[PDB]
Write a protein that binds this ligand. Structure first.
Ligand code: ZN
Lengths: 385, 389
């Protein structure tokens, strides 16, 4: 929040993911209960998700205006803001809501490749190394990452919540447990790192419950009212976070699958002394997770949030101009909404701000004010490519 | 919807959503009271973020309703030239259109059309007088004075003076006007300008409009008119000024039929056409003046919105619907006012088919409505073609 004297914000790039969506229904076979209905088809952005993106867009507009990047009440000059989303409905819609919330009444288009419904290679977290050595090390890293996690209590709580014993996947079986199930990881070329087993089942169930919570469903219709404490949410979130960490937090997988994004960021921020002053990239949680590991971010902890890359969350890269020393500096923040802010659709203003956490690259150590030298930042980006 | 009816074309007449009041130093709002107006997150005259959110909810509801009637396939973007969005070239109207379109068709490439000169009025949405004859100006002012004479606003003026502390206001400290009950109103009906009024009518309308917008924005109750509005009857008494302001300016048939002539002309062209590659869904975003003049020009029957103290509310939209009777091979017209209640506006409630927006079936005097809210298409175009003439 503190800006040293003489510092002028010059450039900003935001790495974002799709907002609150309808789950793509594992969900039916894992429970006898009836899942509550959604207003939108599965995989599409919900109206609440668009509203949450609008609020975040307005806050980002207020913050940018406070730092002199754009003038509040006037549309920025043409080509000042560049919005780029993956060619999926939820990513394009997320970008549209954010841009309209940030610059209502301006003519700022959301760029995307023509083939809608297909992944854009820039946002496609697929493996591009076809060598056998890569796949062996990648799978080993995923299993090593999963080995650190203790998910037995999470599986037990999930089985109790969904009544797993009476589910279609359990009939004809005397004992039916996800605790003893085996997880098999995959690291195939031109495909995303995946996993089969109880990890995927638990991730899908807890993700569905998380989306129900943020959507604003009555509490008795969120996991059928079975989640009764914050600790239970924390125990269940281990499954979602463990799924994400195993697949995209291993450094071997992350440096390969996130290569197009790091290349785009290095091109758009470092070797871009030309022009886009505000860049908004709308991808997926996988892109953010792999990017965080690829750039060797230090570990961080979000407040009032049990996810690592939650909806509405954005990684804001900020190039600042130190006027006294005539040098550029880099400051990176995670600007996100708390669980309460998401569920309640709280308005975000400078007085009632979104949550902010200063991030740090292992290669770009931050000072007491969260800034690090721009040359070390470009060095890290060039070493990652 | 009777069996065999297929919705073929839809035009929605809308206004700008919740905006920030213009309360600078020289403003009517500042001069009318000594109290401090609560500050807004947006510059004056700009659309508020909550207002955009309200349009988003209304946009999603309209998408759900349109899908329910088979106009568009839910979750899929309509063909390119299917949706045409056209707004007045102002920030609040264009932003309102952008929020509605994104809420209705998230992820589609549907642009909001507007003339290039932003900050200036679009002739289609500009309710200015296009008749330069003096006789027209004479009759226009006479009709406005006659319409206002019918209204009883004494209790409204007194309550407003008490609420705003008008006696200690700048408009009385330095301008020598100090009462809204005894104040004089002067109407204007000049060529190439909007019908206007000066006096307590304009002051009261601006003050009550600010209080209503404060309510919809979600300000704490003590910051809505400084906490002085304490009952729904007081809201009704204050709303009398706003309704009287709108009626005096735009309920004269001559003035309304003239200032709204470009808008009625567009609606008649965009609705009666069954042409190839024509837009099936039209969204026109103007101002409450446009809706008021349109209501009088087409000779709408009186209507009552419920759970709403306004006649042309912020979120409300007039949805013209051309339906095709497949059994009888005839076209029919059904007009509805789709709006949000005051609670829905203030609370920013989501609008779904399960929890819908408010709907009221409207009726044209020249197109009598049947038991199902439909009227024949030929009578509707007849009314429209006579109004454009
Ligand atoms: Zn570089």
């Amino acid at each position: 929040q503190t800006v040293p004297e003489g510092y002028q914000l010059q450039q900003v790039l935001m790495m974002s993911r799709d907002n609150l969506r309808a789950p793509l229904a594992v969900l039916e076979q894992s429970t006898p209960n009836k899942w509550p209905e959604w207003d939108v088809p599965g995989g599409q952005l919900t109206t609440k998700g668009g509203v949450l993106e609008v609020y975040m867009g307005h806050y980002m507009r207020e913050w940018l205006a406070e730092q002199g990047m754009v003038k509040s009440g006037e549309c920025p000059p043409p080509y000042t803001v560049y919005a780029y989303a993956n060619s999926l409905q939820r990513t394009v819609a997320t970008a549209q809501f954010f841009i309209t919330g940030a610059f209502p009444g301006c003519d700022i288009p959301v760029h995307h490749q023509e083939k809608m419904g297909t992944m854009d290679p820039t946002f496609n977290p697929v493996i591009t190394d076809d060598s056998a050595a890569f796949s062996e090390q990648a799978v080993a890293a995923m299993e090593k990452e999963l080995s650190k996690l203790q998910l037995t209590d999470s599986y037990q709580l999930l089985e109790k919540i969904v009544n797993y014993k009476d589910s279609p996947a359990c009939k004809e079986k005397q004992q039916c447990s996800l605790v003893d199930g085996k997880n098999t990881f995959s690291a195939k070329y031109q495909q995303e790192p995946g996993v089969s087993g109880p990890l995927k089942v638990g991730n899908s169930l807890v993700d569905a419950f998380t989306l129900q919570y943020y959507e604003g469903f009555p509490m008795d219709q969120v996991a059928w009212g079975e989640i009764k404490s914050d600790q239970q949410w924390k125990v269940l979130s281990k499954l979602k976070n463990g799924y994400q960490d195993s697949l995209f937090t291993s450094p071997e997988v992350a440096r390969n699958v996130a290569k197009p994004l790091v290349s785009y960021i290095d091109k758009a921020l470092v070797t871009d002394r030309t022009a886009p002053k505000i860049t908004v990239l709308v991808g997926h949680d996988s892109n953010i997770a792999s990017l965080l590991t690829a750039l060797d971010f230090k570990p961080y902890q979000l407040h009032d949030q049990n996810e690592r890359t939650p909806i509405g969350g954005k990684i804001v890269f900020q190039r600042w101009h130190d006027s006294k020393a005539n040098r550029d500096l880099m400051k990176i923040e995670y600007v996100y909404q708390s669980a309460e802010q998401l569920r309640n659709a709280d308005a975000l203003t400078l007085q009632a701000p979104a949550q902010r956490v200063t991030l740090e690259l292992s290669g770009c150590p931050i000072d007491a004010d969260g800034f690090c030298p721009m040359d070390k930042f470009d060095s890290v980006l060039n070493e990652a490519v």
